[PDB]
Amino acid sequence: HWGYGKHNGPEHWHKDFPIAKGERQSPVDIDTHTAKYDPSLKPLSVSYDQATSLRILNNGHAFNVEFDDSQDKAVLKGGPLDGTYRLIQFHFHWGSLDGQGSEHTVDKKKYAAELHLVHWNTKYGDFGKAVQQPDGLAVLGIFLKVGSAKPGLQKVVDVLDSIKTKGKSADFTNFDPRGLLPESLDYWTYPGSLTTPPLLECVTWIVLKEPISVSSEQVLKFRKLNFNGEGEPEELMVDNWRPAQPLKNRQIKASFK
Question: Active site annotated at which positions?
């Protein structure tokens, strides 16, 4: 099955998921000089005060922090979006080295990691329905650089030893995702896709301009995770990122001049 190795990595995915070569694939390089300021784009509204985190899961590709999405508790609105998008999970993509790991790039620059806060459009009723719609998902992408520690990330880092291998989960209640946001909500936006199979073209991407900083120790703990299940040969969970895909007939818009 698909993964990030030589024999099952991003260059192979098209054989099972032909949309991999589609018209609105993600991630992309964000060419900052060619993105256009769109003065009509609204400020984002990130309403996470009532968020209810539930669990953290190593799914063999990344780790997901899952939320209760059966009510409007943590929602994203505004910006390029029409309607209300509920937070379902967040996860990260990261590298084996500090100079790679992000999925999106900025003027070809790779960050050490990238956080995806995944939300679905409540007009479609459930996540599984939403991924079948061109405006089904809104993903807030946040770059990570290595520097000072991010205090709001530490509770996530703390629990990773409990979910080392594929299929392990742990209770993860009362986590506040507001602690993962940068100061500014300035963003780029474009229509794209899931960055993992099934690669469905259902995402409005909202990529924040300002990265967060995390420490060397925090990222090193991400890199101790395993792609494998317990009792299988150890393969470190690193370099779980898809490279930039062709922009094709898309324009990236900026919320800021």
Answer: 61
